[PDB]
Amino acid sequence: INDERILQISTVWRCVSLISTLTACLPLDVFETDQNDNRKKVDLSNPLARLLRYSPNQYMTAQEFREAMTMQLCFYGNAYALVDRNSAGDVISLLPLQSANMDVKLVGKKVVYRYQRDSEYADFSQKEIFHLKGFGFTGLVGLSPIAFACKSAGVAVAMEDQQRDFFANGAKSPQILSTGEKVLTEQQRSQVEENFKEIAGGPVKKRLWILEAGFSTSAIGVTPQDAEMMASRKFQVSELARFFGVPPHLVGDVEKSTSWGSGIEQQNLGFLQYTLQPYISRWENSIQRWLIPSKDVGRLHAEHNLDGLLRGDSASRAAFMKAMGESGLRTINEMRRTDNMPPLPG
Amino acid sequence: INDERILQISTVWRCVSLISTLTACLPLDVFETDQNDNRKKVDLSNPLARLLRYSPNQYMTAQEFREAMTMQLCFYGNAYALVDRNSAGDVISLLPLQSANMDVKLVGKKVVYRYQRDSEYADFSQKEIFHLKGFGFTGLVGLSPIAFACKSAGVAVAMEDQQRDFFANGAKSPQILSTGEKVLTEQQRSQVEENFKEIAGGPVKKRLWILEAGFSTSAIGVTPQDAEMMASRKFQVSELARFFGVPPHLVGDVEKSTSWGSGIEQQNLGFLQYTLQPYISRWENSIQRWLIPSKDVGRLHAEHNLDGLLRGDSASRAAFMKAMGESGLRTINEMRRTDNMPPLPG
Amino acid sequence: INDERILQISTVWRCVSLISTLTACLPLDVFETDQNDNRKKVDLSNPLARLLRYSPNQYMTAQEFREAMTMQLCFYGNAYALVDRNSAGDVISLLPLQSANMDVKLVGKKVVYRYQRDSEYADFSQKEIFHLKGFGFTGLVGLSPIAFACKSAGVAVAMEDQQRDFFANGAKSPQILSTGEKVLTEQQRSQVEENFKEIAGGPVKKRLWILEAGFSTSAIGVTPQDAEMMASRKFQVSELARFFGVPPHLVGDVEKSTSWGSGIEQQNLGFLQYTLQPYISRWENSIQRWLIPSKDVGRLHAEHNLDGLLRGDSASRAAFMKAMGESGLRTINEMRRTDNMPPLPG
Amino acid sequence: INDERILQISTVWRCVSLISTLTACLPLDVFETDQNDNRKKVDLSNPLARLLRYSPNQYMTAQEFREAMTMQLCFYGNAYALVDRNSAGDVISLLPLQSANMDVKLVGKKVVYRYQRDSEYADFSQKEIFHLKGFGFTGLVGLSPIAFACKSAGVAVAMEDQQRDFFANGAKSPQILSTGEKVLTEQQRSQVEENFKEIAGGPVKKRLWILEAGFSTSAIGVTPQDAEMMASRKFQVSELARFFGVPPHLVGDVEKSTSWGSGIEQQNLGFLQYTLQPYISRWENSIQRWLIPSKDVGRLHAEHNLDGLLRGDSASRAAFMKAMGESGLRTINEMRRTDNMPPLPG
Amino acid sequence: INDERILQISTVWRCVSLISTLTACLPLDVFETDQNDNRKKVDLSNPLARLLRYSPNQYMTAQEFREAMTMQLCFYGNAYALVDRNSAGDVISLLPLQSANMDVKLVGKKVVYRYQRDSEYADFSQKEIFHLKGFGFTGLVGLSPIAFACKSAGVAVAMEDQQRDFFANGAKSPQILSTGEKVLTEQQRSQVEENFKEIAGGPVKKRLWILEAGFSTSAIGVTPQDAEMMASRKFQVSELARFFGVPPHLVGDVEKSTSWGSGIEQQNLGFLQYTLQPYISRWENSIQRWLIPSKDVGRLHAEHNLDGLLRGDSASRAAFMKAMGESGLRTINEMRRTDNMPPLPG
């Protein structure tokens, strides 16, 4: 078994696609925080904000970069980027690195990111490799989920191959050549192969030979009237989904989320809290832990925006905004800012 | 297996049709933006707006181009256009290129778009190829989904082919042909073919006469009354749909969403937030990253309009507008602009 | 297999009928747009508006013409009309052309519509052929959906013929004729068929004949206890529908749209957004791209009217109009214009 | 197969009956129209109105003529009437013609309506044949639906004939009459044909004898206990209905619409918008294209009235009128006109 | 098969009974219409109103006459009455004529109603035969629905006869009198025929004999384990109903109208619009087309009253009348006229 054959499972493909792409769709904002604890969102004039929101490097989009990082984070439990910085020490480029080529080894109290580029060993400090570092016991690396999923994936590909092959044989069931006691010539015996090479493929339908001996031949295989050849296929989707923690109604099972929450907003809230939330924290805290300078901690901060998911329907959002009317929890201008309407006296 | 034989699957055709069409149906606009963050939608006198909205080239419509680009972006994970620009260096044309003929390679620290034109091997810069660059680990190219889907597609076409030819055989099962209990001449053996083999057609009916030397012929097919046959077909639709991430009830299967909101608007939000959104991001971001010049970033901003999907029914939209009329979140003039009614004092 | 035999499938016939006819039923309006951005609907005095709304040519209705164009657009992915224009360059006739006879070939930078009329090659520029050009990768032609549907159609016509001919044979199931050793005379062997031919056809009911050997006969047909011989007949409708993207409850499956939207308006909204919308855009944008002169772009515009579908029931439309009462979103005169009631002081 | 044997299918009869009847039941009116777009319904003193509403010819009713025309338009995709006009050139009669005897051909740039009258071959102009010209690729003639439906109709009539004949033979299965190994005289054969075969009739329950050759007689019918028999009949109703586009619950099948609105008004809207509407368009447009002279276009306008279908129940209509009374969208006099009540001050 | 045997099918009997009787129950009113477009209902002093509402001839009731006409109209697609008139040309009698004896033949431009009275040919003009003329392609006669229904009726009577006979035979299964090879005399063997007949008949339960050769008998009746003998009986009802267009829940199928309309009024509205309406129009328009003199057209008019069907329950009609209270859409006197209550100051 190998990683690409595993990635060819539709369920795996979908999960990885979904998680990475969703977190890549979110707006990411950067803030300067005043001493009275007020946020100001910062502009593309700020070097870090430009690096993040506009361009990570001379080859990529921001969206594209976050997606690419997150794919490795999910697939390998870990993702790595080269960090580049100017003479003032401010970062100026980020560039993803293939996790499969990375090693990280401690060196006395220190750490070295040992990157195997082909047959060359590009060795780096904690100050120039970002390392998003997923779920794992050591706090030094995430556990690579692909490495654990290998057995259930093994079951899934085994069934899929059997299922293919049965229909590829035109459902011509395998036969015992159960026989009798007549002397057969070696050519009579040879006919059993010699006449054929089509009991898998070709339309020798009414015609599959036996010798001048009649014989008693009968089927060997169990037939996919063994209902596992359906039911078991369905069952595997849950097994694979459980490595990623994805609600199976988003994947395709049964129908829809039967007793859990009614409207779309409840589904989104559930999906956020039980699945999407960790990645948000991993990104935001890593940025705070390594990219923001220690003197700017507490002043400078970064957040993903959730409203693109938490968006309810027209009726609910109208009712919500009306509930801000009395109570006065917003001005008309603040509400008009949420949908970029022109400001108005109030 | 090949891409055309795959695209002939109704599911695959429908998925690509749906996504590419829907995003091509959206309105797409550009705003100039003031320093106080007021929008100003720009006119067809602006070259970029004209290019995007009226005409991408002297052969095509805007819609028609966006559609074609998006089809490649889904099918191959990547799409490419040749850019062209005037003596001022401002863009004046876009023309699609075959993702199947394109290659992108790093060449020193630079990159080259190698395009196989027919029997020639053109090379191009990041300066002149637009490259929409979908989902993938490198951040340099997208994973071509057709390449991964090939196995489940292989199963689907295997089942489909087998399923047909059973009825093409007049629904008669494969048979073991024992040559009786005595040897016969090679011509008598040839007459087994003269006697039989046309059992795939209708009219044979009764001339299935056992010759005067015993014989013991019987069936070796399992019958489509096996527990796979029908259910097997249904299952595989989901497998193919998962490569594109489309909710199967939109693909026309079985039963519609019971438990995430019943109203059409909630279906649209679900489809947007979990399927359409990323493509919207990729377009808008690519335009901002490569086509809008750096000096105009934050001044100029391209966006799609969502309202064509987020449209509610008469009752909901009436209630919504009334809830903005009271509270005063809009003037009558703003609301009348949404449905292009003549303005009034307000 | 051939296009007419495919068109004889009820599902295909219905889909093509529905889509083309619905878009042909819609009102199509033309507008002059004032510099203050107010629409004026234009009259049958305008040459283009008359060409469109009243008469495309000396043989046809407007409705009839739009229908005819749209049938080819759906069936072949493409539709073509000869364009005719006066000495002032204004268009004066449109005439549809059979897509199967069309070729389009590039000629250096130029394009030639190569029309094979019988054995003659009527060759035309982009300035005199309209070309509605559907969904496809090149932006130069739409993919012809019939060409892809051919395989699922193949399965469908196979099952249909088997289903017929089983009852055409009165379900007189086919048989082995057997004994083991008696010499049949060549007349006995003749009579084994020559007595009959009505074993397929007529009422030989209680009296198929042996010859003088008793016989030990047995059957070879599977019986339509084969679950496909009902379940598959149902299933294939979805396959065909997926080439056109039609919601199967409009076609005939199960009952009605189970969990999707309650009232008729929600069904119409769904059908518009997920199926009908693209054709609207293709028409409207093609008109804008080729028929309206470049100097009149932005001034002159055309729209289909959706209200004939978006029409809710009496109660909902009454409630809607009442909700315009306060809020004041219409005068009584504007509402009376929606149903052509005489205007009244207000 | 033939058209009458097809029309004898209950489905086909019902579909044609329904559509042609319903559109013939609608009121049809003409408005003269002022330059300020006020309607004025015209009187039976107007020749065109009299022709349309009182009498199409000295043999028929208006309703009766519209019905007959529409039957042909559905059944043959086309319908034709001979026009007649007075010395002023104004129309004074319409008479239907057989679509089965009509042909239309291009003749130079002109067209000829070739009509086979009996054993003669009359020819007519576009000036004197009305030609309602239904759905089809050319825009010159409609596709005759009966021609495409013939295969599924073939399947339906095959089953219907088989179903009869089973009970007509007293529900006794077909048999191989196997006697044994004795040679038979032609009289002994004649007595197999007369002692026996008669069993397929009614009364001979008692005796059916076997001679001293010992016999081996056995059945070859599958029995209608097979899984097709009943469900087969049901399925085919949908197939035929799809050529006409009628919702099967209106055709009296199985179960009524669960999930597009329960109220009768929503059934009517569904049937209108998805089935009836196109015919309404074809009539009104044909009249405006050929019968109303060019100088009167936009002044004179023929229309059907929809209210006979859009009629709500007592509760809904009361609420609706009250919602126009308040708001003031009607006078009492207008509302009293709808149900022809005497007017009052208002 | 014959018309009376067809009429003996309960479904056919019910449909004809229902339609004809319902339209015969309706009030029929005649109106003089003032020039200001006000209706006056006319009295039994008017000759036509008396002929219609009180007495058609010296033998019949009005109800009875309308019923009788409508039965022929449904059954034969056509109904005919002799028209009689005074010296002033005003009609004074109507008398129905058996449609089966009628022929109508054109005579140059003229028409002759050729009535075969026994062996005599009573020949008449359009001025003295009324001819209600139902649904049909020519506008000269209706298609006789009985003539088309003959095949499905054929299936139905085949089942019904078989179903009778099986139980009339005491459900004894018909027997092959199988044996072996022992001799018996022809006189011994003849005792089968001599003795028995009660295998088809009645009381001999036990001593069905054999002649002295031991015997080995077997059955040949399929049994109504053939589910058609139940399920198909049910199915036939729809086939027959479809010739008349009657909603099968009114006839007896399943239970009640499952998803279609809730209260009785919705059922009545549906039944009116989709089934009853055409006959109303046929009557009313025929009266207007032939019985009312041309000078009185527009002045004199006739309508059936629908309120006897459109009658909702006590609660709904109370709520309705209360909704007329404010709004003022009736006076108390007008409402009291609807239920013949004495008028009162208002």
Residue numbers in the entry:
A (entry chain F), B (entry chain G), C (entry chain H), D (entry chain I), E (entry chain J): 52 to 397
What does the publication say?
Tailed bacteriophages and herpesviruses use a transient scaffold to assemble icosahedral capsids with hexameric capsomers on the faces and pentameric capsomers at all but one vertex where a 12-fold portal is thought to nucleate the assembly. We have determined the portal vertex structure of the bacteriophage HK97 procapsid, where the scaffold is a domain of the major capsid protein. Assembly of this large complex from hundreds of protein subunits requires transient association of an internal scaffolding protein or domain that acts similar to a chaperone and is absent from the mature capsid. The mcp gene 5 encodes a 103-residue N-terminal scaffolding domain (mcpN) and a 281-residue C-terminal domain (mcpC) that exhibits the HK97-fold including a triangular A-domain; a P-domain, composed of a long spine α helix; an adjacent three-stranded β sheet; the flexible E-loop; and the N-arm.
The asymmetric reconstruction of the portal vertex shows that the portal and surrounding capsomer density were equally well defined, indicating that the portal and the five surrounding hexons have a unique mutual orientation. The portal clip domains visible from the exterior exhibit neither strict 12-fold nor 5-fold symmetry, suggesting that the 12 portal subunits adjust to their incongruent fivefold environment. Visualized from the capsid interior, these stripes correspond to ten ~100-Å-long towers that surround the portal and originate from the surrounding capsomers, two towers per hexon. Thus, the scaffolding domains adopt a pseudo-12-fold organization, buffering the 12 to 5 symmetry mismatch at this special vertex. Cross sections along the portal axis showed that the portal/mcp interaction is mediated by mcpN, including some of the surrounding S76 to S88 α helix but primarily by the flexible spacers and coiled coils that adhere to the portal’s 12-fold symmetry. Our model of the portal, despite lacking 50 N-terminal residues that are not visible in the density map, revealed several contacts with the scaffold that occur in a groove between the wing domains of two portal subunits in Fig. 6B. We observed that only one of the three coiled-coil helices interacts in this groove where it is surrounded by a polar distribution of charges: lysines (156, 160, 161, and 346) from one portal subunit and aspartates (94, 135, 141, and 169) from the other. We show that no less than 30 mcpN domains interact directly with the portal.
